[PDB]
Design an enzyme around this catalytic site. Structure first.
Site, short mmCIF file in Angstrom:
data_model
loop_
_atom_site.label_atom_id
_atom_site.label_comp_id
_atom_site.label_asym_id
_atom_site.label_seq_id
_atom_site.Cartn_x
_atom_site.Cartn_y
_atom_site.Cartn_z
CG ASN A 87 78.26 11.22 67.13
OD1 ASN A 87 77.26 10.72 67.67
ND2 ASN A 87 78.91 10.97 65.94
CG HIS A 128 73.37 8.67 65.51
ND1 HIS A 128 73.52 7.82 66.63
CD2 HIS A 128 74.53 9.33 65.60
CE1 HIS A 128 74.55 8.37 67.49
NE2 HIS A 128 74.99 9.29 66.83
CB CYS A 143 71.85 7.91 69.84
SG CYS A 143 70.74 7.16 68.92
C1 LIG Z 1 70.81 5.42 68.49
N1 LIG Z 1 72.34 4.94 68.51
C2 LIG Z 1 69.84 4.48 67.93
C3 LIG Z 1 70.67 3.40 67.18
C4 LIG Z 1 71.20 2.25 67.95
C5 LIG Z 1 71.55 1.09 66.77
N2 LIG Z 1 72.64 0.31 67.21
C6 LIG Z 1 73.51 -0.40 66.30
N3 LIG Z 1 74.25 -1.25 66.70
O1 LIG Z 1 73.17 -0.45 65.08
N4 LIG Z 1 68.86 5.21 67.16
C7 LIG Z 1 67.80 5.61 67.78
O2 LIG Z 1 67.38 5.94 68.87
C8 LIG Z 1 66.64 6.23 66.88
C9 LIG Z 1 65.82 5.14 66.25
O3 LIG Z 1 66.27 4.47 65.38
N5 LIG Z 1 64.63 4.80 67.02
C10 LIG Z 1 63.84 3.92 66.36
C11 LIG Z 1 62.99 4.09 64.86
C12 LIG Z 1 62.69 3.43 67.19
C13 LIG Z 1 61.70 4.38 67.64
C14 LIG Z 1 60.83 3.77 68.59
S1 LIG Z 1 61.35 2.34 69.38
C15 LIG Z 1 62.77 2.34 68.08
C16 LIG Z 1 67.31 7.26 65.58
C17 LIG Z 1 66.82 8.47 66.59
C18 LIG Z 1 65.83 7.57 67.44
#
Ligand SMILES: *C(N)[C@H](CCCNC(N)=O)NC(=O)C1(C(=O)N[C@H](C)c2ccsc2)CCC1
Length: 255
Positions: free
Chosen positions: A220, A200, A30
């Site tokens: 989305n 997200h 995302c």
């Molecule tokens: C977007 N889809 C992503 C969620 C993926 C989870 N997948 C699932 N099966 O549950 N979320 C993101 O990219 C964000 C994020 O949470 N980033 C985390 C905090 C991160 C930051 C640096 S390394 C990991 C939400 C906007 C960014």
């Protein structure tokens, strides 16, 4: 100064990407999609529709590396836009579209709805960074790169975010997803039930008011049979689910 409603799709009718909903598939990308979608819009706006291209999610997803985050296991939108300023992004359309340099390699799926596609599963593997365009596409990978002048945070202020969209085009934002959001069909989303599922990233392309409720117009990346044709509206003006707290953007270089 700002209008009561604004929709980027109406403002820039010759910019087809602004209307386009993508599908991130079974991969937590995302952060990449919010970025490349808004970048695609901004290149078209910046050129008055003389350049209109789908910027590649694949390229951003696979080639940024550690500075952005962990690929299909989440990322940092701020650094996605920074990558665009530093190394640029090639073109690339939807899965098996054969459109652009690096089309998306992860297949589409049904995100919390019923449909003919397979059901989305958890975070699949990040594809490899392949600095080569697909067969049949011209020009070369190096020559197909689009670069940003800058990347920046927009302040946590409703009016500043509105001004940014109104002047410079769609932005990327992020919000906390609760389980009731997954069932969204129409109207203005406000969180009323369910636990926290995680953050997200999405694309904000306007605002308005519906039955007295102010909202942000959001795209989305869960395909067009989720929500309201792939879009949703979410309450505006109270940093609802953090929607005003992580807005990011950037201005293109001229190709
Ligand atoms: C977007 N889809 C992503 C969620 C993926 C989870 N997948 C699932 N099966 O549950 N979320 C993101 O990219 C964000 C994020 O949470 N980033 C985390 C905090 C991160 C930051 C640096 S390394 C990991 C939400 C906007 C960014």
């Amino acid at each position: 100064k700002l209008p009561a409603s604004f929709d980027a799709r109406e403002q820039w009718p010759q910019c087809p990407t602004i209307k386009e909903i993508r599908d991130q598939g079974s991969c937590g990308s995302c952060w990449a999609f919010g970025a490349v979608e808004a970048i695609s819009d901004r290149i078209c706006i910046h050129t008055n529709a003389h350049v209109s291209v789908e910027v590649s999610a694949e390229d951003l997803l696979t080639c940024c590396g550690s500075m952005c985050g962990d690929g299909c296991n989440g990322g940092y939108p701020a650094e996605a836009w920074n990558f665009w300023t530093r190394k640029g992004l090639v073109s690339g359309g939807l899965y098996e579209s054969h459109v652009g340099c690096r089309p998306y390699s992860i297949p589409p799926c049904e995100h919390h709805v019923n449909g003919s596609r397979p059901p989305c599963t958890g975070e699949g593997d990040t594809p490899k960074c392949s600095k080569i365009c697909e067969p049949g596409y011209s020009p070369t990978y190096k020559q197909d790169k689009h670069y940003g002048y800058n990347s920046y945070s927009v302040s946590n202020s409703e009016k500043d975010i509105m001004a940014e969209i109104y002047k410079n085009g769609p932005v990327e934002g992020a919000f906390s997803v609760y389980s009731d959001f997954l069932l969204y069909k129409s109207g203005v989303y406000q969180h009323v039930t369910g636990e926290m599922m995680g953050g997200h990233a999405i694309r904000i392309l306007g605002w308005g008011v519906e039955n007295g409720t102010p909202y942000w117009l959001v795209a989305n990346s869960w395909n067009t049979d989720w929500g309201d044709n792939g879009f949703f509206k979410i309450l505006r003006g109270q940093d609802h689910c953090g929607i005003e707290s992580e807005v990011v953007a950037g201005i293109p270089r001229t190709d």
